[PDB]
């Protein structure tokens, strides 16, 4: 009968990619994020928007300051040494898989930094562009980031899927497999 | 290689037993290094690495700033909790339990992550030979897990969304 | 439509 929870406001600005990101986390899940370019709040579940509001330009303003701060930290640090923490990738199905019964594949990229990856879905060794979903860079307990990639599919014994993730810390693109 | 530069900041609101005990932990990062901290339990900024010392000294000299921050335990943290207590905190999603051949207990599509799964063979909890995948977060506010028993037979699932325990049994 | 509160970023400098 003890309600124990955590709310995180996570925001960053990245170079040389010149992009920033702003989001709220509740007990390990995304509540929302703000599209900095488009300036709109994006609720993780559509149903959330019926209960809460977030003024979008608030997030824009912060990122601007975070942008500026980045310059200050750069000039401050004598040597900025490039270092990478390589991701660990996991593929699995959202639900128990039944043949002919629509489902979702989840590509769980975890424990990595910087927040930049190339992720590719592969049906039978060929890239897939239809039915793919992505999540902003999510926060952790540590300094590392977390990410989800989703793929909708119809199960059959003929198809096999792969999720291929590339990150500046990997020697070779990591490819994680899944079949029936 | 490829040089990169990150200015990362996480403001954590910690709730132990609702809004009774609450602490704020603001953490500033530079690339891979946590450099600055604001711990509401300390009430001042503290440098984690030398890189954060200037910010710490700068901001700690601002009383009205620190005064505002310590108050953010109420003005921001508890403020938001009041809102989230209406839909996020009480959010309940009933699990879907499935059994298939080692015997697998597939508990899928549930929220929150508070879940207990036991294996009963002939009515006693087989507290040995249990292989679990652990809790798995789908990232869409739904969880899943596989609890397995290595014997050559019914599993029970208890959850906050269930008034009465869920049971499944195999022939 | 209750409006969530947030932390405001402070410029670093001197």
């Amino acid at each position, epitope marked *: 009968i003890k309600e124990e929870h955590t709310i995180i406001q996570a925001e960053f600005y990245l170079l040389p990619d010149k992009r920033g990101e702003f989001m709220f986390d509740f007990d390990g899940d995304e509540i929302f994020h703000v599209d900095i370019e488009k300036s709109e709040t994006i609720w993780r579940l559509e149903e959330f928007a019926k209960f809460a*509001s977030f*003024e979008a*330009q*608030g997030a824009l*303003a912060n990122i*601007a*300051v975070d942008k500026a701060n980045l310059d200050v930290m750069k000039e401050r640090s004598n040597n900025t040494p490039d270092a990478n923490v390589a991701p660990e990738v996991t593929v699995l199905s959202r639900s128990p898989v039944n043949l002919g019964e629509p489902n979702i594949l989840i590509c769980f990229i975890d424990k990595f930094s910087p927040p930049v990856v190339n992720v590719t879905w592969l049906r039978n060794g060929r890239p897939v562009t239809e039915g793919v979903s992505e999540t902003v860079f999510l926060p952790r307990d540590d300094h590392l980031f977390r990410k989800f990639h989703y793929l909708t599919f119809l199960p059959s014994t003929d198809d096999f899927y792969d999720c291929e993730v590339d990150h500046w810390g990997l020697e070779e693109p990591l490819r994680k497999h899944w079949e029936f | 290689s490829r040089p990169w530069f990150l200015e990362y900041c996480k403001s954590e609101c910690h709730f132990y037993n609702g809004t009774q005990r609450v602490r704020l932990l603001v953490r500033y990062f530079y690339n891979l290094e946590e450099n600055l901290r604001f711990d509401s339990d300390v009430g001042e900024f503290r440098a984690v690495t030398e890189l954060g010392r200037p910010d710490a000294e700068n*901001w700690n000299s*601002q009383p*009205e*700033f620190l*005064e*505002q921050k*310590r*108050a*953010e335990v*109420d*003005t*921001v943290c*508890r*403020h938001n909790y009041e809102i989230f207590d209406n839909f996020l905190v009480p959010r309940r999603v009933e699990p879907t339990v499935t059994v298939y051949p080692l015997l697998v207990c597939s508990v899928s599509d549930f929220y929150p992550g508070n879940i207990e799964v036991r294996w009963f063979r002939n009515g006693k909890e087989e507290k040995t030979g249990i292989v679990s995948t652990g809790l798995v977060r789908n990232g869409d506010w739904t969880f899943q897990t596989l609890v397995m028993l290595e014997t050559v037979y019914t599993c029970q699932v208890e959850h906050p969304s269930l008034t009465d325990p869920v049971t499944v049994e195999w022939k | 439509a209750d*409006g*969530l*509160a*947030y932390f*405001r*970023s*402070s*410029f670093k*400098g001197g």
Partner: T-cell receptor
Amino acid sequence: GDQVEQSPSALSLHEGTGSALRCNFTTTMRAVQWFRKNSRGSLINLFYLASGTKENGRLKSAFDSKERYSTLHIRDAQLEDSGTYFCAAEASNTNKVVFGTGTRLQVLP
Amino acid sequence: SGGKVIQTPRYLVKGQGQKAKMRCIPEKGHPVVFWYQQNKNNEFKFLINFQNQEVLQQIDMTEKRFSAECPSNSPCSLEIQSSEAGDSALYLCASSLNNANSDYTFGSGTRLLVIE
């Protein structure tokens, strides 16, 4: 119309009496500020409150973040206390400072 | 200087269509500057704010009708390009230290009157 409810509008105090001003907020404020504008004088900064109370000479200020109000108390009213009193606070859910409607205080000798 | 904000001139009268430039010296060491326009009903109208030389925010009117800059080691300025009767008001300058704060400290303000 988009300001803070500040009461009373106007106030007359006999020299040596006291009264209180009060701002009512429509949401959680991050902190409150109080000003006095003299006679042909500048805006004088009186208090900055983020929480609790602060007392400065004959002035005491209080801010309750939850109950969404702030009060300014004048005791032992003096001639120089005459003027217009403003409150100003910014919401925790926005970026913008909003002001009170103002209180004109006249102190009778 | 400080802790004081110096606004000049105390008063200013201009003819309709003339320019009205007013100046403000923020507190020593204060990077944050705001311009407010107060009317007869004690309402505070936001015009524009600066962080040093950079403009963080301003309204449509200040963008189209006003020109303001806060030059390094120089008095901040707000100038009306073509004054009209509607611009008669008290213009307030307030300086802060930390952009994520209140604790404004206001100047004496410039009283502007525009006449035909």
